[PDB]
Design a binder for this molecule. Sequence first.
Ligand SMILES: O=C1C[C@H](c2ccc(O)cc2)Oc2cc(O)cc(O)c21
Lengths: 195, 194
Amino acid sequence: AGRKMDIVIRAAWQLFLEQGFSATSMDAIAKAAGVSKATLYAYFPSKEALFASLIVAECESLQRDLPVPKLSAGLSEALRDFARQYLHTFIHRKDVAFVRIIANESGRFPVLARLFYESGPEATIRRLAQFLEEARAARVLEFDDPMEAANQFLSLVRGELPLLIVLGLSDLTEEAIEQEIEAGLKFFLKACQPR
Amino acid sequence: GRKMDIVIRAAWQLFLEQGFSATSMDAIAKAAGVSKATLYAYFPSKEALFASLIVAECESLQRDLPVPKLSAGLSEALRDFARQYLHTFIHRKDVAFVRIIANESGRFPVLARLFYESGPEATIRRLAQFLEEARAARVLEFDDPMEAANQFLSLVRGELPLLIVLGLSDLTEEAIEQEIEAGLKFFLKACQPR
Ligand SMILES: O=C1C[C@H](c2ccc(O)cc2)Oc2cc(O)cc(O)c21
């Protein structure tokens, strides 16, 4: 239906962040959003389905803010743009929050854990890997597996940032981001360019 | 010495149960059976107590990590270090500590950075010393040792910490050697003389 749905999502996100997923009840969500349990369960048949809707919405959205790298832009420039958008999504979006909420469930909801992984981090690997296939086909990178190589690129460029963010110590200027990206990219190319 | 270690353990218990902010020096003194006089004589503040806990726990986690010896062979040294490094992630040895700090939501930055510098950055510095020996022996090339140590650890760690924290990792010994070999292969393609 209508406007109470998006009020329900926002009310639920707030409670999941402050209290965790299992600690938040559909009862509390209904109260916070000012709907009957009838209206709430008509939109989302369970708490699990609600969190699933939230994961898929945020991950589909983060995926749209990511360029599709074109080799016509230059190899270095393509990878530098992708890296830059990838780190911006980390800093300015809910990935770390999602992981904190699921990690706090101590393995109770594996189906939600996998849904987040496959909609987000694995989706980002697959998008980069498609582009790394194009670049290997153009004989300008060499590697055995594109998914393996996409994971390596993202690991290099990401470094320890997710831990710094979770500890409240990531406070890195745009200039500091370009340095992280340049170092990861330099190293990826040292390993994958024909030599 | 005498009292201190009972106070440390009593405080660790309360920090885990209740969190750092929620725990009072009053409760720590009660739990350890000392006067507030005795407690404040050993420790200036709650912040100082947590600091002693971080330094002790990080020095201890650091002792479960080899010192890589170049005399053992480059690949073998790195493979042993990588293996012991990933064992820390798999047995969730940092997890409780990090949950306590992360739950303070950036209210205690000096404690957060002391944990970072005493633990994860300490691991980078140990590896960087070893990569300097290897560069001096002309069997790796790279511009900055700490940059290179961070890259090695990033490659070998990959996605594993995320899979573990989400409860989607259960790794056989054979799967760990494959993670290490892939990271090591890549690191050497980039740093070996060509
Ligand atoms: O793959 C990683 C690495 C990171 C991490 C890095 C260093 C460390 O010491 C602990 C954790 O944890 C994560 C947390 C995330 O939200 C997303 C991620 O992709 C990761």
